[PDB]
Design a protein around this ligand. Structure first.
Ligand code: BCL
Ligand code: BCL
Ligand SMILES: CC[C@H]1c2cc3[nH]c4c(c3C)C(=O)[C@H](C(=O)OC)c4c3nc(cc4[nH]c(cc(n2)[C@@H]1C)c(C(C)=O)c4C)[C@@H](C)[C@@H]3CCC(=O)OC/C=C(\C)CCC[C@H](C)CCC[C@H](C)CCCC(C)C
Ligand SMILES: COC1=C(OC)C(=O)C(C/C=C(\C)CC/C=C(\C)CC/C=C(\C)CC/C=C(\C)CC/C=C(\C)CC/C=C(\C)CC/C=C(\C)CC/C=C(\C)CC/C=C(\C)CCC=C(C)C)=C(C)C1=O
Ligand SMILES: CCCCCCCCCCCCCCCCCC(=O)OC[C@H](COP(=O)(O)OCCN)OC(=O)CCCCCCCCCCCCCCCCC
Ligand SMILES: CCCCCCCCCCCCCCCCCC(=O)OC[C@H](COP(=O)(O)OCCN)OC(=O)CCCCCCCCCCCCCCCCC
Ligand SMILES: CCCCCCCCCCCCCCCCCC(=O)OC[C@H](COP(=O)(O)OCCN)OC(=O)CCCCCCCCCCCCCCCCC
Ligand SMILES: COC(C)(C)C/C=C/C(C)=C/C=C/C(C)=C/C=C/C(C)=C/C=C/C=C(C)/C=C/C=C(/C)CC/C=C(/C)CCC=C(C)C
Ligand SMILES: COC(C)(C)C/C=C/C(C)=C/C=C/C(C)=C/C=C/C(C)=C/C=C/C=C(C)/C=C/C=C(\C)CC/C=C(\C)CCC=C(C)C
Ligand SMILES: COC(C)(C)C/C=C/C(C)=C/C=C/C(C)=C/C=C/C(C)=C/C=C/C=C(C)/C=C\C=C(\C)CC/C=C(\C)CCC=C(C)C
Ligand SMILES: COC(C)(C)C/C=C/C(C)=C/C=C/C(C)=C/C=C/C(C)=C/C=C/C=C(C)\C=C/C=C(/C)CC/C=C(/C)CCC=C(C)C
Ligand SMILES: COC(C)(C)C/C=C/C(C)=C/C=C/C(C)=C/C=C/C(C)=C/C=C/C=C(C)\C=C/C=C(\C)CC/C=C(\C)CCC=C(C)C
Ligand SMILES: [Fe+3]
Lengths: 305, 53, 275, 44, 250, 53, 44, 53, 44, 53, 44, 53, 44, 53
């Protein structure tokens, strides 16, 4: 039986340039390419993109942050292109040391460049957030994507903005290296007792696992009912066919309750969004409220002794 | 010269946005660089000058 | 109590083992042959968990833990109070998980639809079986399985992680984390896009699937498409499961030092070895 | 007349004149600021 | 706020976690009730209202506006299914299968069940028919993979029922959705691409017998297809996966 | 002099919204720099000036 | 007529005037505040 | 020589924007590299020259 | 297609001329800056 | 040596951009390898030549 | 006149000529630079 | 003897680009191998030869 | 003249000729370089 | 004998490209194998032979 995992025969007509629903067309590029290796899995069209004020500004600020991280790597390699490549994952642009507190007076190669890059990184993610909002607004769509992105941004900002301010030191923000930010994560768990005994870290993991499991379930369900017009999820929300019914009856017979075509996406939205929302809460409480989650768990009756 | 022909090439809106962005970036970066150096950090300089001011 | 469209789908057929012997529903739940076996396995495992809790000193459901046998029993069957209850529950868990998948197969056969759901759940089952069977068999002791408890199995995760230094430096672990993070991001974006199209700005007609192609093409330049997003989410989650299982399988069987030292192949490449 | 931007040459004249006025104002302020800062703490 | 606790060991952390549990119970209530907009109220096995309806009450009515002058849709609708189902219960109790009273595939029951959708074509964002034969699309062309047109089509018993003569594509999402089969029976037939495997020599359909191909639900027109016709065709093949499985080899 | 023609180029609504958000964030940012520096933290300065007020 | 916004050359007169009034109010308040701060705690 | 004909081949928008970005980034890199060297750090040099300026 | 860019022969002239003057001004300022820096602290 | 026929085949835009990117990267790599070497690092060499320049 | 780009023979000629002038300038300046560097610090 | 006909088989653009990238990478490899070995590293060789140059 | 590339016969010979000339120049320069490097520091 | 029939079966372009890439990888791998062994590293051998070449 055909498993709808890969397309068998690809087809292509005139390239699709998008819906016009209040988008400024002069900010939308005009060139599309049609790349058939992608058409085995999904769409083949590498479509146009929209480039307006917010996107341009976000790209400029983010690219400058990226550039500044790179330049710091070059300088700490003592200019060597060999060390630069050998340490592309092991090097990091680190925040100022604890003695500088939250002041903006730390040497340029000991946190100052970290501060400047961090400022421009902050600017670009917020501008990208505004972009996600405004692209929905220009098409007349709801704002669910921007809200979901706000949750992930909330974890990001508690990581490097909110919590270091509440702790009184930039030195607790995460550095900009591939391996050093993993080292940062490990150190963070090690200094706050053990982050497994942080209930919001537990809840964040539950929502991460659940969102992975949920989208295994949902992708498998839609693929299983693809024989019927299944993946046309919109228009099954407003005109229920057998794909939606059989999808509902599978899960009802299996676990005793089911979702609807529209409502499974609310479950997934909330499970995905709750992972960084709950995670940010648990990091924010670490150090500020609880210093040692292990003894806190012992006091609150979920760690023995 | 007659540089005005530049506005025949580029849309003024994009130019103004880009130019404001780069000016803002430049000013922020210079001010933060001066604050990072303890010879041009004016807050701390004043603190020392006026015996805590 | 049937859904208002359910009746026409409640027909005989689709079973694998026992014909019409178990071909009936109990409330919402289809039973079938593997519903009988999954109920029995689940009940016996739960009930042995409760019995093992009774032999301890706490009834707190966050302190109850059933522990695997000590290493000195190797791969033998342990005395029932010295790890044997763990083995009974583990065998019951495998029985129930496998029965659950086979029951899912029968439901798919009755509602003639693809078998993708039991396949994906089998990937989850494989991760579990790697954790409690495959890895401890290669290491030669059931006691390398993880203790059963809401917060004590996290002690297992901690101890095994810190056996190999910082477990982050495990390339398969890195790959698995990226797949978990990416599938969560993809679920967020897919749910958001569907909800945005179905729930427009106030007073507007419902959006089309063209509008959502247009939304991602505007935002990132690419749209995978309606069929593509489900294929993508399915394979992302399945790969996360599989590469996590490979991550843990490699640790203690073929790799034994701090995982950080694995990257010494790159850091000790002879041209920049000494720099 | 060629228009990548839809601007006629007479519109370009006025736009350029106003742009130059603003740029000169900005530069003159920055020059005064640099003289003051140089007197306060010279950096060369 | 370290070590400073409300209530004698109740913290800002304790407060946060209890607050989350309260919010999450409310969100579960909201999510469950949102997911009850189809299929309720629960019925009994004779088409009448069920005695039990569950702990969750139904949500308030919500309306969808449909583009291209296709009215409004309010859910939950409280309406019962708008088709008759030729089944008959096999037991006086509940929880047992109902048996087909005639041909399950022709009646449209079980895995061959179709839902009564509207007898109009699904539309793309510009108001045109979404799924059409390539003779109509006329700018579509095969881009990769092997073209099935002209190949013989082989049923789930190894007998050839005809040849692929046309593809029906989705003009919005650039995809082939149906294969039009010219039958030696004497007529034509649409086969869902999700139910066909294209190979070098033939397209093999392992869900439907050769005798079943003589009675595939037809379309009114050969330039467009309604959602009702789509449901009937796809349901016919998916039901064949049960009601034709004995015709397979061995 | 004739700077008014910016309103013929940029939309007044969007420039006012952006200007307001920019000014608010700038003000917050400067106040937080000053509170960060223990030479311009006015609460602690006033505490020490009046001998714990 | 050049209008990237659709506004009138005169409508820019009135908007510019009112915007300048608000601008000058804000800047005058900020100037007085800076004078007061500089007296209270000079930074240069 | 007769370099002008390149503007019939290359779009002036792309070339001008790319040159602007490249020159800006190059200048920033060179200045940061000079500031890192404690022999060409002009802020610290002036600090030494004037006895803390 | 002689004109990959929509420019003609003469307006290509004018664009090249203004570009070349701008480039010359940039380079001359850079030369003066390097002379001054070399006098201040020679790097060779 | 009638090599101009290469322009009949190769896109001048593509080849010019590729040459420029490649040449800039090459020059940067050579310069950085020189700066890395404490025998050709001209900033530190001049510091010694002029007794801290 | 077959051409993957569509440029005729004569535009190829003038483009090649201007390319040659640019290339010779670059190499000759680089030659002078390498001579100066070898005088300053020989490397082989 | 008559190897020319191969330009009827292989497209000249692909061959020339592949060969140019090929030769560049090979030359870079050989130079890096010589630099890696401290017996053919010509910068340090010259440093020793000319008394730190 | 069947041709995958589309070039007819006449391009083949001149393409090969210029290719061979560039090839021989490259190897000749490489040979001179290797003789010089071998004299400077023999490796065999 | 009559092996040229394979050129009617396997495309010369794909076969030749694969053959070239394969031969290069093989020669590179053999050379790096030899350079790894401190018995056949010809650079170090020449160094010892001429007393640091
Ligand atoms: C020794 C290591 C510690 C540990 C220390 C930490 C720490 C420290 C943290 C976590 C966090 C998380 N941990 Mg952990 N954790 C451990 C063990 C585990 C285990 C396990 C099986 O052992 C698991 C499954 C997890 C799981 C998780 C996640 C649920 C959670 C992050 C959620 C999220 O949304 O992330 C992914 C989302 C983000 C990182 C958000 C930011 C991403 C932003 C939005 C990106 C924007 C764009 C970007 C700027 C630019 C580039 C784009 C361009 C295109 C190039 N932890 C142990 C105990 N864990 C976090 C948390 O929430 O804790 C409560 C956290 O901070
Ligand atoms: C000190 C701790 C170490 C560490 C040590 C380990 C160890 C050790 C392991 C992992 C594993 C994993 N870690 Mg780690 N990990 C750390 C930090 C992290 C961080 C982080 C941000 O810091 C993250 C995101 C992760 C992420 C991950 C995942 C890639 C993976 C867990 C998923 C998995 O296995 O699913 C697989 C899913 C399952 C096994 C679930 C199976 C479910 C079954 C089939 C059904 C059960 C039904 C139930 C009984 C029913 C109840 C009935 C009710 C009605 C519902 N780790 C640190 C550095 N990590 C684990 C792994 O890869 O496992 C394979 C693992 O073993
Ligand atoms: C519900 C929570 C999950 C989630 C949600 C989420 N993320 C989102 C969204 C949502 C709903 C978006 O709408 C938004 C988006 O647009 O997605 C497509 C986004 C997105 N989440 C992203 C990443 C991301 N999300 C993550 C996590 C998650 N996001 C959660 C699991 C992570 C993790 C796990 O760490 C990452 C890394 C992005 C793809 C995107 C946000 C885009 C963004 O932030 O843009 C800001 C731009 C920059 C920093 C610019 C970078 C520029 C390049 C470096 C330029 C390169 C130039 C050249 C190579 C040279 C450069 C150097 C110099 C010479 C210039
Ligand atoms: C488009 O499609 C989609 C829907 O549908 C339209 C959906 O529904 C769903 C399904 C998903 C949801 C409804 C969202 C919520 C689901 C989750 C968050 C997943 C987590 C769910 C749980 C917490 C699992 C709990 C349920 C279980 C395991 C049932 C337990 C039942 C038993 C142990 C006993 C079963 C009874 C039997 C076998 C009776 C036997 C009788 C005898 C006498 C023997 C998906 C994925 C979907 O994509
Ligand atoms: C003791 C007190 C403890 C607290 C207990 C009280 C909590 C009660 C709140 C109710 C509980 C949840 C149940 C209802 C919430 C579910 C959302 C909902 O009701 O419907 C979704 C609605 C949108 O409606 P919709 O039909 O989708 O149409 C919109 C068209 N644009 O609206 C939405 O979509 C909501 C979208 C925003 C939701 C959050 C988005 C996250 C954004 C960034 C989060 C970061 C903030 C982190 C906060 C941490 C603070 C420490
Ligand atoms: C165990 C001893 C009792 C079982 C022995 C007799 C079982 C006979 C088979 C059976 O279960 O009958 C099916 C039962 C009745 O449904 P029948 O479908 O009634 O017709 C509907 C008419 N309205 O179908 C049902 O409706 C079953 C559900 C009845 C209501 C159950 C209420 C909740 C069940 C207990 C709470 C959940 C806890 C489950 C276990 C938790 C373990 C931790
Ligand atoms: C021996 C102890 C037994 C329990 C301990 C196990 C741990 C439990 C923790 C998770 C709870 C899982 C239990 C799920 C119950 C499964 C039975 C079931 O849900 O079906 C019964 C009920 C009836 O269905 P229906 O009639 O259709 O409802 C609508 C009609 N009014 O259907 C419904 O109720 C519909 C409502 C769906 C319920 C939503 C499920 C929420 C799951 C989200 C959890 C994710 C976060 C978990 C955090 C974990 C932290 C450790
Ligand atoms: C320390 O170093 C260690 C790295 C030694 C080892 C290094 C080994 C190396 C680096 C081996 C390198 C070998 C190579 C690749 C040498 C270079 C070959 C090439 C491609 C040289 C090209 C040189 C110059 C050209 C083509 C001319 C450039 C300048 C011009 C002005 C002409 C073209 C450009 C422009 C802008 C003019 C025409 C375009 C317009 C728009 C007018
Ligand atoms: C501070 O943080 C760190 C340390 C990062 C490093 C940087 C320090 C510095 C110095 C950063 C640079 C700061 C900048 C950008 C300073 C420049 C500031 C500017 C341009 C301020 C301009 C302010 C206000 C203007 C131009 C106008 C204001 C107008 C109003 C307030 C009136 C608006 C109300 C009106 C018009 C009422 C009528 C409304 C309608 C809709 C008719
Ligand atoms: C040592 O560390 C170094 C690393 C600090 C960091 C940076 C070094 C570098 C790269 C420094 C140099 C950067 C550059 C390229 C600076 C050049 C700056 C420029 C071009 C400034 C020009 C500004 C011109 C402006 C702001 C124009 C107008 C001003 C106004 C206030 C707007 C008035 C214009 C109007 C009203 C025209 C609107 C149109 C109509 C019809 C009304
Ligand atoms: C050839 O040219 C170049 C030089 C391209 C070579 C480049 C090499 C590059 C680009 C290397 C870059 C490497 C890496 C490793 C980039 C990624 C780093 C990681 C792991 C980033 C993860 C970061 C996580 C967080 C939570 C980051 C930021 C969070 C924020 C809330 C940002 C805002 C924080 C602050 C403190 C803003 C400061 C504001 C003021 C006013 C001081
Ligand atoms: C010093 O510290 C560390 C930096 C020691 C050492 C760094 C060593 C390095 C990285 C050395 C090598 C650097 C490299 C590879 C530099 C390459 C520089 C290049 C390619 C410069 C080429 C510039 C080319 C042009 C055409 C430059 C300027 C032209 C203009 C600005 C045109 C202006 C006309 C315009 C914008 C038209 C409108 C007119 C106006 C006035 C706006
Ligand atoms: Fe979906």
């Amino acid at each position: 039986e055909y498993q709808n995992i890969f397309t068998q025969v690809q087809v292509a007509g005139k390239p699709e340039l998008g819906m016009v629903e209040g988008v400024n067309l002069e900010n939308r590029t005009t060139g599309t390419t049609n790349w058939p290796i992608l058409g085995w899995f999904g769409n083949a069209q590498l479509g146009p993109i929209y480039l307006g004020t917010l996107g341009t500004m976000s790209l400029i600020f983010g690219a400058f942050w990226f550039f500044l991280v790179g330049v710091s790597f070059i300088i700490q390699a003592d200019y060597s292109p060999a060390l630069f490549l050998r340490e592309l994952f092991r090097a990091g642009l680190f925040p100022p040391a604890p003695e500088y507190g939250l002041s903006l007076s730390a040497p340029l190669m000991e946190g100052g460049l970290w501060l400047i890059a961090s400022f421009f990184l902050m600017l670009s993610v917020l501008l990208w957030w505004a972009r996600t909002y405004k692209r929905a607004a220009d098409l007349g769509m709801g704002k669910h994507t921007a809200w979901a992105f706000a949750g992930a941004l909330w974890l990001m900002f508690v990581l490097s903005f909110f919590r270091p301010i509440l702790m009184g030191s930039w030195s607790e923000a995460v550095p900009y290296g591939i391996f050093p930010h993993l080292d940062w994560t490990n150190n963070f768990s090690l200094t706050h007792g053990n982050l497994f005994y942080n209930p919001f870290h537990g809840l964040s993991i539950a929502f991460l696992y659940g969102s992975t499991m949920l989208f295994a379930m949902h992708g498998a369900t839609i693929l299983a009912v693809s024989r019927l017009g299944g993946e046309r999820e919109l228009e099954q929300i407003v005109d229920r066919g057998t794909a939606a019914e059989r999808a509902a009856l599978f899960w009802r017979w299996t676990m005793g309750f089911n979702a609807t075509m529209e409502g499974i996406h609310r479950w997934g939205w909330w499970f995905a969004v709750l992972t960084p929302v709950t995670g940010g809460i648990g990091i924010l409480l670490s150090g500020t409220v609880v210093e040692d989650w292990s003894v806190w768990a012992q006091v609150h009756g979920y760690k023995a002794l | 010269s007659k540089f005005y022909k530049i506005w025949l090439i580029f849309d003024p809106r994009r130019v103004f946005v880009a130019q404001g962005v780069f000016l803002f970036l430049l000013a922020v970066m210079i001010h933060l660089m001066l604050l990072s150096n303890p010879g041009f950090n004016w807050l701390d300089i004043s603190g020392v000058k006026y015996e805590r001011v | 109590a049937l859904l208002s469209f359910e009746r026409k789908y409640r027909v005989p057929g689709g079973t694998l083992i026992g014909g019409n012997l178990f071909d009936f529903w109990v409330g919402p739940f289809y039973v079938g042959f593997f519903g009988v076996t999954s109920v029995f396995f689940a009940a016996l495992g739960t009930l042995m968990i409760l019995w093992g809790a009774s032999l301890g000193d706490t009834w707190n459901p966050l302190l109850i833990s059933i522990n695997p046998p000590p290493l000195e029993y190797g791969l033998g069957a342990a005395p029932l109070r010295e790890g044997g209850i763990w083995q009974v529950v583990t065998l019951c868990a495998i029985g129930a998980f496998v029965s659950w998948a086979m029951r899912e197969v029968e439901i798919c056969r009755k509602l003639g639809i693809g078998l993708h759901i039991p396949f994906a759940f089998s990937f989850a089952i494989f991760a579990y079986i790697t954790l409690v069977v495959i890895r401890p068999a290669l290491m030669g002791a059931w006691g390398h399985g993880f203790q059963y408890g809401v917060f004590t199995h996290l002690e297992w995760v901690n101890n095994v992680g810190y056996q190999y230094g910082n477990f982050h430096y495990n390339p398969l672990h890195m790959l698995g984390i990226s797949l978990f993070f990416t599938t969560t991001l993809a679920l967020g974006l897919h749910g958001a896009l569907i909800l945005s199209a179905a729930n427009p700005e106030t007073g507007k007609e419902m959006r089309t699937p063209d509008h959502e192609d247009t939304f991602f093409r505007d935002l990132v330049g690419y749209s995978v498409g309606t069929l593509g997003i489900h294929r993508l989410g399915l394979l992302l989650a399945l790969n996360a499961a599989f590469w996590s299982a490979m991550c843990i399988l490699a640790s203690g069987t073929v790799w034994f030092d701090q995982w950080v030292f694995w990257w010494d192949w790159w850091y000790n490449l002879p041209f920049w070895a000494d720099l | 007349d060629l228009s990548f931007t839809g601007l006629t040459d007479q519109q370009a004249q006025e736009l350029h004149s106003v742009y130059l006025q603003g740029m000169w104002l900005f530069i003159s302020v920055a020059i005064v600021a640099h003289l003051a800062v140089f007197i306060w703490r010279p950096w060369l | 706020m370290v070590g400073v606790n409300f209530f004698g060991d109740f913290d800002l952390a304790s407060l946060a976690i209890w607050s989350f549990w309260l919010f999450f119970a409310l969100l579960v209530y909201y999510l469950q009730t949102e997911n009850m907009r189809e299929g309720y109220p629960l019925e009994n096995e004779d088409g009448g209202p069920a005695v039990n309806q569950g702990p969750f009450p139904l949500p308030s009515q919500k309306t969808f506006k449909l583009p291209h002058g296709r009215g409004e849709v309010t859910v939950p609708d409280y309406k019962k299914e708008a088709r008759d189902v030729a089944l008959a219960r096999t037991a006086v109790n509940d929880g047992f299968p109902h048996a087909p009273t005639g041909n399950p595939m022709l009646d449209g029951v079980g895995p061959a069940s179709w839902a009564p959708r509207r007898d109009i074509p699904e539309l793309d964002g510009h108001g045109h028919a979404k799924v059409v034969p390539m003779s109509v699309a006329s700018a579509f062309f095969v881009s990769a993979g092997r073209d099935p047109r002209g190949l013989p089509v082989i049923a789930n018993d190894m007998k050839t029922v005809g040849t692929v003569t046309e593809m029906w594509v989705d003009v919005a999402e650039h995809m082939v959705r149906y294969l039009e089969v010219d039958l030696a029976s004497g007529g034509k037939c649409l086969v869902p691409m999700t139910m066909a495997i294209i190979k070098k020599h033939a397209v093999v359909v392992q869900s439907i017998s050769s005798a079943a191909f003589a009675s595939v639900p037809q379309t009114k027109s050969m330039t467009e297809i309604s959602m009702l016709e789509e449901e009937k065709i796809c349901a016919y093949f998916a039901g064949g996966t049960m009601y034709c499985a004995d015709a397979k080899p061995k």
